[PDB]
Ligand binder design. Structure first.
Ligand SMILES: Nc1nc2c(ncn2[C@@H]2O[C@H](COP(=O)(O)O)[C@@H](O)[C@H]2O)c(=O)[nH]1
Length: 299
């Protein structure tokens, strides 16, 4: 499975989402079952490191990928599942230079993925909650535009949720024992107690995550601390980064290689390369159509 590095699967150009033919021929060739893990988030938040580490790459921490966008893929063998492939998706360029296909790229990632990894800096903020809410419903509207006819049946389709918090080497709070990353999640996910229309327009995203993301793991990561940029524009190695950061991101990878399920369609048919090509074309066609059937909401 040659793939030395990542490759764009869906490119964002002129506000126009175009699926990659070169990427589709690759997917087609892979007959084995797939575990799709989408590392989504804002640009320049350290997503690439999770990708390289997940792809098994030893030297995978770049330092400034200076310029002078869409969904990139990386198909490697699954390091804990022989006969299974690991497809890695990355939402490139989200909010970089900034119709704004950010939500759509976000949605396709969640759609195509078997596991959903949201990557953000600092403490959990409303802005993240709102778009997480927005994508949940957006994915509902797109998936529904593919169903043979014009709700515990949509929750079964949704991927697992993983939140990776970055530069949040802070994460210091407790009751009597220090909070775990997981406990921090539920905490920052606690609903506001108030019969108001400000707390209402605050608890909706929380309520949405409560229903649509049943399995939820959280990861807090330390600030990556390393030797100075010895001649700029390079790619460091683990032995040159904060040992804690390396161990944290490894413990993350381990959770992925073990807990992440094989991508399945409706009826429970495992998804393989050619099956993912179909899903990429279907979903790109459902979006690029500018159609979208207006059915009832799902919140
Ligand atoms: N703030 C922050 N940047 C990181 C971290 N890990 C890697 N980076 C940097 O963030 C950039 C990665 O961009 P990305 O893949 O999220 O679009 C690279 O320039 C890399 O040097 C991290 O944990 N926190």
């Amino acid at each position: 499975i040659h793939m030395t590095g990542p490759m764009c699967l869906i490119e964002n150009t002129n506000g126009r989402l175009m699926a990659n033919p070169e990427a589709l021929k690759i997917l087609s060739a892979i007959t084995q079952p797939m575990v799709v893990v989408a590392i989504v988030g804002l640009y320049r938040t350290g997503k690439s490191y999770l990708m390289n580490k997940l792809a098994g790459k030893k030297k995978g921490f770049s330092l400034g990928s200076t310029v002078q966008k869409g969904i990139w893929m990386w198909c490697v063998p699954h390091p804990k599942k022989p006969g299974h492939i690991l497809v890695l998706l990355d939402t490139e360029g989200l909010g970089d230079v900034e119709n704004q296909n950010d939500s759509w790229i976000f949605a396709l990632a969640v759609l195509l993925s078997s596991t959903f990894v949201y990557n953000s800096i600092g403490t959990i903020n409303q802005q993240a909650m709102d778009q997480l809410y927005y994508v949940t419903e957006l994915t509902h509207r797109i998936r529904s535009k593919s169903s043979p006819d014009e709700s515990a049946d949509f929750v079964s389709f949704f991927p697992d949720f993983v939140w990776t918090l970055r530069d949040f080497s802070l994460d210091l709070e407790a009751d009597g024992q220090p909070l775990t990353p997981d406990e921090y999640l539920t905490y920052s996910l606690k609903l506001k107690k108030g019969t108001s229309q400000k707390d209402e327009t605050f608890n909706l995203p929380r309520l949405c995550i409560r229903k649509f993301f049943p399995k939820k793991k959280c990861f807090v990561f330390d600030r990556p601390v390393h030797r100075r940029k010895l001649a700029q524009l390079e790619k460091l190695q683990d032995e040159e980064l904060d040992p804690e950061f390396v161990q944290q991101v490894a413990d993350f990878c381990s959770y992925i290689f073990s807990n992440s399920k094989t991508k399945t369609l409706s009826g429970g048919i495992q998804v393989n390369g050619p099956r993912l090509e179909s899903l990429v074309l279907t979903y790109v066609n459902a979006i690029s159509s500018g159609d979208l059937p207006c059915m009832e909401n799902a919140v």
